[PDB]
Design a protein around this ligand. Structure first.
Ligand SMILES: */C=C/C(=O)N1CCC[C@@H](n2nc(C#C)c3c(N)ncnc32)C1
Length: 290
């Protein structure tokens, strides 16, 4: 790998950091400070993550760990693409494709449920992203959630933040088998805990509310996951039978029964939103403009 260049859309300039104008930070980063930045030759805007050599040794490790994955996933359309990097005596700058926002912040702006047609095209993207990292690189995300699903003005939906990926994330979306690992721990007991997390997220974004109510502590959530029934989609909101049975499949608590990505990608709910046209781009711009 190299650090001189910026490969965008087939081209590849050879600039340094000062060739970019800093237009501000895009929220307090949890895996590195992220700036929205603009070229001085052309005016094109990108996202640029900064790792200070002086930074916390633990954040920096995750920044480099997320960088390790996104350098290897250029050919996956459903993962935030990295354009290149710069290494100065004091910083590392990671150039990323500029995205609109996360689905967690999208939910707060909507002030309500997100339509099924959008969650549809989201499901196809995340599952295929989680599947690519598994099949091609044997990596698991280990922290899927609405704040890790980025959308943009063009209607793209990509997964991000592989900071704790590997060959413990947020507790609310953690899978049953990660909360209490099996009696003898097989190395790949973890291989499908991400499916359960995306199911929790789909229920959250579809209903506008997190399915485990009134937990004042992290552990209290963990106990509901294991004691209460899986929180399937309600019946009184016009959700289709395909959407409800896909959410039921992912939310099967017994991990030896949760279907592999192999057959989740066969699901009708997926096959519909592969060939179905949905103007997520226009729907995105509208909620933002609101
Ligand atoms: C819900 C969005 C969110 O809170 N953040 C946290 C701060 C970083 C920010 N962000 N990260 C990346 C990356 C990689 C991007 C990209 N690529 N585009 C827009 N915003 C991003 C997400």
């Amino acid at each position: 790998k190299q650090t001189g260049y910026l490969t965008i859309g087939g081209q590849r300039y050879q600039a340094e950091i000062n060739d970019l104008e800093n237009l501000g930070e895009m929220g307090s980063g949890t895996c590195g400070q992220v700036w929205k930045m603009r070229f001085r030759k052309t005016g094109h805007v990108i996202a640029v993550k900064q790792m200070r050599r002086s930074g916390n040794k633990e954040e920096n490790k995750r920044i480099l760990m997320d960088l390790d994955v996104v350098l290897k996933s250029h050919d996956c359309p459903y993962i935030v693409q990295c354009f290149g990097t710069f290494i100065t005596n004091t910083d590392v700058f990671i150039a990323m494709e500029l995205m609109g926002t996360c689905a967690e912040k999208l939910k707060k702006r909507m002030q309500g449920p997100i339509p099924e047609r959008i969650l549809g095209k989201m499901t196809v993207a995340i599952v295929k992203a989680l599947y690519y990292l598994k099949e091609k690189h044997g990596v698991i995300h280990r922290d899927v959630k609405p704040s890790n699903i980025l959308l943009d003005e063009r209607g793209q939906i990509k997964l991000c933040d592989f900071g704790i990926s590997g060959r413990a994330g947020c507790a609310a979306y953690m899978a049953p088998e990660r909360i209490d690992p099996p009696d003898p721990t097989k190395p790949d007991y973890d291989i499908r805990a991400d499916v359960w997390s995306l199911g929790i997220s789909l229920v959250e974004l579809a209903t506008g509310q997190f399915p485990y109510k009134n937990c004042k502590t992290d552990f209290e959530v963990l106990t509901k996951v294991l004691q209460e029934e899986p929180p399937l989609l309600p019946g009184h909101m016009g959700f289709s039978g395909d959407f409800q049975s896909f959410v039921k499949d992912c939310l099967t608590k017994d991990h030896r029964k949760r279907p592999k990505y192999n057959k989740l990608l066969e699901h009708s709910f997926i096959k519909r939103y592969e060939t179905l046209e949905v103007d997520v781009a226009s729907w995105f711009k509208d909620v933002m403009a609101k």
